Amino acid sequence: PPVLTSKDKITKRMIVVLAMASLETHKIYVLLNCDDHQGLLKKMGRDISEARPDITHQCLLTLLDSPINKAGKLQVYIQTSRGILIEVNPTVRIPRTFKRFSGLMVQLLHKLSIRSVNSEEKLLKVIKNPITDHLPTKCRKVTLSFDAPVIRVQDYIEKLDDDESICVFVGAMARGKDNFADEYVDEKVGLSNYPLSASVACSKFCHGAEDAWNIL
């Protein structure tokens, strides 16, 4: 199982893009968050409710822990709400606790990439917009939305062409319209008759893709 990156535009895979991710640093440098920085966000005149980097953190853990990741058939990108685009190497160990995650994101946003000790390989890297320049050549692009017709993921995946990847844009936000990828996507689809958290929408999509692709 070779490690997938944007250089490979052929291999059929699943891609998840965590869009409108709230990853923004402020010098106290910390990753702005609604719990710790209410006072600051308020005196900044920002919407207190929108600084939710915990959503991106939880989605990353969900996604990189999944069997489809371990089987080498997942890539994740992050598009932040400030327009930064980040390619996540499949093998990166995202810190399990929010505090260490926050430290890692500050370093990434400042330096533009993170490598390991011992290796030049970038495990996280800021790359140039737009995301469509990096995705596979044959890639169905979908936004997940409560407001769109509900699909069974297995069925949807089984309808892909044999050489066609699937890129899912998921809003990594507490609230907002699901229009964040309307210029890239082919279709919007819902996964449930209930509204879901971004992380659960991620897990549900991954599970369905695992099932359709016989990844256990």
Binding site residue list for S-adenosyl-L-methionine:
144, 171, 176-178, 191-196
Between the alpha carbon of residue 149 and those of residues 20, 106, 137, 156, 191, the distances in Å are 22, 38, 26, 12, 8
Q: According to the binding rule CB under 6 A, does residue 201 interact with ligand SAH? A: yes
Q: According to the binding rule CB under 8 A, does residue 99 interact with a copy of itself? A: yes
Cβ closer to ligand SAH: 130 or 176?
176
Q: According to the binding rule CB under 8 A, does residue 199 interact with a copy of itself? A: yes
Q: According to the binding rule CB under 6 A, does residue 208 interact with ligand SAH? A: no
Q: Please, what is the minimum distance in Å from the beta carbon of residue 88 to a copy of itself?
A: 17
Among 61, 112, 126, 148, binds a copy of itself (CB under 8 A): 61
Cβ closer to ligand SAH: 132 or 192?
192
User: Do the Cβ atoms of 202 and 170 come closer than 8 Å?
Assistant: yes
Look up residue 97 and give its amino acid.
T
Distance CA 216, CA 134 (A): 28
DSSP designation for 109:
H
Among 9, 12, 70, 115, binds a copy of itself (CB under 8 A): 70
Among 48, 176, 182, 186, binds ligand SAH (CB under 6 A): 176
Per-residue b or e along 157-192, where b marks 16 or more CB atoms closer than 10 Å to that residue's CB = beebeeeebbbbbbbbbeeeebebbeebbeebbbbe
Look up residue 64 and give its amino acid.
L
Look up residue 130 and give its amino acid.
P
Task: Give the residues lining the site for a copy of itself (CB under 8 A).
Answer: 33-36, 52, 54-55, 58, 61-62, 65-67, 70-71, 96-100, 150, 152, 154, 191-194, 196-197, 199-200, 203-204, 207-208, 211, 216
